[PDB]
Amino acid sequence: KIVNIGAVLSTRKHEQMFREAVNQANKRHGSWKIQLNATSVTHKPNAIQMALSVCEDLISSQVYAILVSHPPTPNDHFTPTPVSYTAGFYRIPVLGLTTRMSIYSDKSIHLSFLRTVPPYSHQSSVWFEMMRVYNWNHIILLVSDDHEGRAAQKRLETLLEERESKAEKVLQFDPGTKNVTALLMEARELEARVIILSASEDDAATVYRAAAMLNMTGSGYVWLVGEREISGNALRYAPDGIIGLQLINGKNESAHISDAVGVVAQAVHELLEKENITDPPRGCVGNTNIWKTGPLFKRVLMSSKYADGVTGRVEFNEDGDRKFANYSIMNLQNRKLVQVGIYNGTHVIPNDRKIIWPGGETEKPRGYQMSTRLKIVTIHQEPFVYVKPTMSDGTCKEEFTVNGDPVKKVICTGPNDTSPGSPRHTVPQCCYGFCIDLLIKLARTMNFTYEVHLVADGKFGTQERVNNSNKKEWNGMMGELLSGQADMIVAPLTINNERAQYIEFSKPFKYQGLTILVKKPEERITGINDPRLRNPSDKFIYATVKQSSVDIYFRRQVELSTMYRHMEKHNYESAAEAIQAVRDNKLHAFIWDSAVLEFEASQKCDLVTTGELFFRSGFGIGMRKDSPWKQNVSLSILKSHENGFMEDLDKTWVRYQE
Template identity: 70%
Template sequence: MRLFLFAVLFLCSCARAGCEPKIVNIGAVLSQKRYEQVFKDAVTQANQVYGRDKFKLTAISVTHKPNAIQMALSVCEDLISSQVYAILVSHPPQSNDHLTPTPVSYTAGFYRIPVVGLTTRMSIYSDKSIHLSFLRTVPPYSHQAHVWFDLMREFNWNHIILIVSDDHEGRAAQKRLETLLEERETKNKKRNYENLDQLSYDNKRGPKAEKVLQFSQETNLTALLLEAKELEARVIILSASEEDAAAVYKAARFLNMTGSGYVWLVGEREMSGKALSEAPDGLIGLQLINGKNESAHINDAVAVVAQSIQELFEKENITEPPRGCVGNTNIWKTGPLFKRVLMSSKYPEGLTGRVEFNDDGDRKYAHYSILNYQKSRLIQVGIYNGTQVVMNNQRKIIWPGGETEKPQGFQMSTRLKIVTIHQEPFVYVKPTMPDGTCKEEMTLNGVLIKKVICTGPNETIPGRPIVPQCCYGFCIDLLIKLAMTMNFTYEVHLVADGKFGTQERVNNSNKKEWNGMMGELLGGLADMIVAPLTINNERAQYIEFSKPFKYQGLTILVKKEIPRSTLDSFMQPFQSTLWLLVGLSVHVVAVMLYLLDRFSPFGRFKVNSEEEEEDALTLSSAMWFSWGVLLNSGIGEGAPRSFSARILGMVWAGFAMIIVASYTANLAAFLVLDRPEERITGINDPRLRNPSDKFIYATVKQSSVDIYFRRQVELSTMYRHMEKHNYESAAEAIQAVRDK
């Protein structure tokens, strides 16, 4: 009966209310009035697909206002006061203010109401610490780096110059491209590319930025591009605004950097408006497909919002959005959840293609047209389908200078920057003459020693200032011969940190960077290393070596034992202080014997007065007696006559016996044990494998030997022992062995 009454009451309430679905308001800030009808039609179409009887979407729209304050007030009064669940916002195509959607994002974001951007491309909106609830159906300009990266791989360009404006957009593009390059490099570290020529090795390793050049309004663009012109790379990627790009093109044309051999890769901003009027022929640019089709983006955004609201209604209890801004500081509790649902939504059948969002709320899998600027016209020569570049083989690209063949992307410089290291006898470093020249010297055979000027830190001056110095030696002779044979000029400098090159962790992170000569070569500070650099697996993965001019293995340097003289060996049983005390004791005892025998009154007492009185010891006789007792030579005459002197003589004889016995025993022990120390037999010598605390051995820090010991697991015990004793240079290590 109760169940029946409840059913009757429910039916009555439905009849009274009509069981109407919940009204869900969707707001929009559109660029023009004509798009308001497009928005309403999109909402009507979404109601036919989504919601069914649970909710009904209602469209509430306004157009952009002249300034930010009016726009924020309009959002509060016209949209938030109507309790909108989400706000769509476009970017006026003719507006020079790229931050037009900012008032909408700030105002709605304060209440955590999701904002869906339609045509906003600026990278600042990816920063979720500023734009809390913002997502968009277009990618930011910085995502064009993915297309640039794929184009570099498509055309096998491995050396690029990146020129970016010193603003948020330029830095975002730089960061995105550098991340892609680092990821590619990390993947290739595990691969073995030995026995490849340089071109094949570069193709396998992938592209890398030879130089990143930033510029601002105050930058001298001519000087900046001159710096780029001196580099080997001829592929230039530009990220800048229309006005800045136009200025760069003008400066590049003045420096003849838009002709044959050069490649210019740009984005959408750099080939539109003012920039396009100054763009050089052969330019390769990008254009987002449907990027400015506001109608298509409105339809896709409404569909994504409707789909997400349906998912939200099925799973969660939704609280009401805030009503108005005046006196209301409470955020919408369901807002963050709704934003997460929106960002995880997938709409594969959109008018602009598949609609998905990444963790920053930016559009994924965007499609681009790849355009070639030919005779003042933009010709599509390929597309980027969201994952890879697909070129149109039916349309040939016209490259800068009117070339039809793909440029190599680099040029070989005839003036090379050579880095070397002070390592005798391969490279000697001496100061220059007062006039800045090198002193001429001859070898013992009368051959002139060839010297070159090399800049580098002076080790003999505090602070190690960078000064010109004279370098010569085997490696310098080799460099001079190479330059004559290969027809190039050079400038030589010493490595700044004095190291050959090894990988070190950066700030205790997992990222590793090369230091020393390896770091300068890979960082573009040098074109070639001419030094006694050992070939190992780690280095061979990054650079190409010539045929080694010297083959050598591991050599162990020990101090040469100095042979001891035979006379010296007889003195070894006693220390020098003991020898001095024994010699002093002999003479002291002799003097005491003389005095006692001369002045003792008991020595003159005679039992029989008729006997002849013995003569007292003279000083020389006492000395003879003292030495005779010590050396056990026997005393025939000249013995002391007094009782006290004889007692002293007996004590001295006992002492002499102990001294002689100790000396004889120690001498025998020294002669038996005095064998030369066994030589180190090699790396497997027990003294190296199981070292004692007093047995010290070491090598040069961050050298090839240091890398070898660090890499070999079976030598880990040896490496731990030697690591704390390693030296900064070979000269220091050799001197330490000499001073041992």
């Protein structure tokens, strides 16, 4: 008829308040014969023999609730772990009260640990509530702590699953270093300015000093950290105007202990209304049997419903944390902490105090600086990308067309040849053609400059397993775009299902089908329906570009896998190699798009296309994810579609014949 409560507490005043709350816990519960005894222990400068003394004293005491209430620990590890582990050896709930580490969030590791505080990742949820107020969609994550970094990124992806958006850049590395400045300069080149930081005080002061040396406290920069990053020398290195968080009654020890005693007491008086009430035996000497109502009492703690307390309502969720906590939002006004907001269970209310920013105005900084210099990557398309070496040094020969129009070239940068032939010989030459003048029209339309460069290979890009770690990766223009080295694939890119799963698309500019290049008895093929090409031989040589999207499109078509096993013996790197081989009568057929071969038939009259016109598809501009260059650019493309500018581009190259 007795219940023991164990605690690790040092100060005699909080021990007296703890014993007074234990004595007053049986006040309003009538004249029932239950008794509540309390046992508190102090601290030894070590941690192993502390764990030993506490664990065997609470085994000999047979307590039901174990409390740790020491925020000023001299060790910066903040680990009450071994007492909770020894209680989890017999499945006894330990109620942690001070630390907020996410490693305690794992119920698989911490089988019988509960706490009345949330981890810091929920603060990012509050920062997700910052995404619901100021209409922000691109963040920059920086976490040094690898113990909580995976859980923080998992919670971040869970929160961004509702919007189905992704973070722009995430970083995890070893704490204690000082060169993170190159990563900060790479973050400077990004569009967003949202700085999310999750580390200790040393790494926070290091990145504050690194941002102060780079002078990242200008206009548009978003600064948003927590309570751990505004203490110690990080408070000395703190730039003004920074927006931080504050835990309401997180440091207030006495009311937290009183609320914990109320929660434990009402949980015990709820558990006394049930049967199958087992007791943990003397497990120190000759008793390794587990406490049989471990998960039962844990489920009793799962259904803990409350309506009274000092601060607010307390309830344990599927993770065992405190919900609906009130937070404070502080601002650093000239190295002075000024409160600028309050936070309810789910809602933010800024007060009448102004929001002073480190940059310019007091309104929200529109920190999405879009790319005004687009790194344009392209592949060498023969009717679209005409590449010519310069005359003397970086100049373009302004040749005139037959319509009185000078050719508007561009200084592109490209290699000589492929990697076995020419490994690294990249020069700036002059590029012009269809998509070059299309990009010139886009630059005339919108507010941007650009940077035209080429791709290192002659391939679009296919998904293939890299030989280490058994992972499928990309290459080509998709491999260079997703690496961040490029900005916009301006190329006749093959639109299919697999590419749209990873990036976003625009409206297609080119619309054409598929055909067969032959040379001119039926010398023609009449498309795919030739029965001699269904079961091929060494006579009719049909082939395609190596690592092309037509190969993937025919790889999905499992009913013509024999053509998949036939073109693999004759895969060519570029289409110009196929033109050179079919002019010298080494090839016999070539699956390729319609209008390119029609232009080559206008070049050379012996080139003949086939009769069947299948897979009438469209080619557009390769794009990034959700970006401010999506809606404006698609409206500009549609404006180019509605007028006769497509006919003008036909008059440049397509409609003209030779």
